[PDB]
Swiss-Prot record:
Family listed: Belongs to the ClpS family.
Subunit structure of this chain's protein: Binds to the N-terminal domain of the chaperone ClpA.
Superkingdom classification of source: Bacteria
Signal peptide location: none
The protein's name: ATP-dependent Clp protease adapter protein ClpS
Length: 81
């Protein structure tokens, strides 16, 4: 059973940081990171990647840790895929 990692839109986190997160933690190409960031901006939520449960939890935690240490409120969660 695999799990999708999601990021949520907000009106505080810079677009460029979201792209950075997608490239750093989810192995996204520049183009794919840009498109996912924009999809989240437009739709409120988007999929970052799909992993086993414990790896998805790891990615969520790494994103939250990174975001808060960069002074951004970016929300990240996971759901069964």
């Amino acid at each position: 059973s695999l799990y999708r990692v999601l990021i949520l839109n907000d009106d505080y986190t810079p677009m460029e940081f979201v792209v950075y997160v997608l490239e750093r933690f989810f192995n996204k190409s520049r183009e794919d990171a840009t498109r996912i960031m924009l999809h989240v901006h437009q739709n409120g939520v988007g999929v970052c990647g799909v992993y086993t449960y414990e790896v998805a939890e790891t990615k969520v935690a790494q994103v939250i840790d990174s975001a808060r240490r960069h002074q951004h409120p970016l929300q990240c969660t996971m759901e069964k895929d």
